[PDB]
């Protein structure tokens, strides 16, 4: 018996030293075995990396960077990992709008698990929602 194994890729946050709604009830504050693996690098680094981070949740909040993200980038390992638990799941981002529309990314959200939770989703964005890919995996 063990805790969810969960993940979150590139650069999140943490309240700490820059206050946000992170740790409101869950993500960490639940007790999960929560890493939180730095930026982009090659996908064969980031795939040694998926041995440690072999993380049933891996939400890459990606500030622009990597093969349309971590999408075609660490989803496309991800494909030819196993898929198993591993939901990948994106965030982050600055200058956003346009995702709550593309037909692409959310291509890959119906068509895999790529969802994506940036500034304006709920105080327990991609916590929740990468619970909700668990639970949908």
Same mark, same amino acid.
Request: aromatic share 6%; with cysteine; proline share 4%.
């Given at each position: 018996?063990?805790?969810?194994?969960?993940?979150? =890729? %590139?650069? &999140?946050? @943490?309240?700490?030293?820059? &206050?946000?709604?992170?740790?409101?009830? !869950?993500?960490?504050?639940? =007790?999960?075995?929560?890493?939180?693996?730095? %930026?982009?690098? $090659?996908?064969?680094?980031?795939?040694?990396?998926?041995?440690?981070?072999?993380?049933? !949740?891996?939400?890459?909040?990606?500030?622009? =960077? #990597?093969?349309?993200?971590?999408?075609?980038?660490?989803? #496309?390992?991800? @494909?030819?990992? +196993?898929?198993? &638990?591993?939901?990948?799941?994106?965030?982050?981002?600055?200058?956003? &709008?346009?995702?709550?529309? $593309?037909?692409?990314?959310?291509?890959?959200?119906?068509? =895999?698990?790529?969802?994506?939770?940036? $500034? +304006?989703?709920?105080?327990?964005?991609?916590?929740?929602?990468?619970?909700?890919?668990?639970?949908?995996?």
């Amino acid at each position: 018996m063990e805790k969810k194994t969960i993940v979150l =890729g %590139v650069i &999140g946050s @943490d309240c700490h030293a820059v &206050g946000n709604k992170i740790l409101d009830h !869950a993500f960490t504050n639940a =007790g999960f075995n929560v890493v939180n693996i730095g %930026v982009l690098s $090659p996908q064969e680094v980031f795939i040694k990396a998926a041995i440690e981070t072999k993380a049933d !949740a891996i939400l890459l909040s990606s500030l622009y =960077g #990597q093969g349309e993200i971590d999408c075609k980038g660490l989803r #496309q390992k991800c @494909d030819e990992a +196993g898929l198993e &638990g591993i939901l990948l799941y994106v965030g982050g981002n600055i200058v956003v &709008g346009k995702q709550h529309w $593309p037909d692409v990314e959310k291509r890959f959200k119906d068509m =895999g698990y790529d969802r994506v939770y940036a $500034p +304006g989703t709920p105080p327990e964005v991609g916590i929740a929602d990468l619970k909700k890919d668990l639970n949908i995996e």
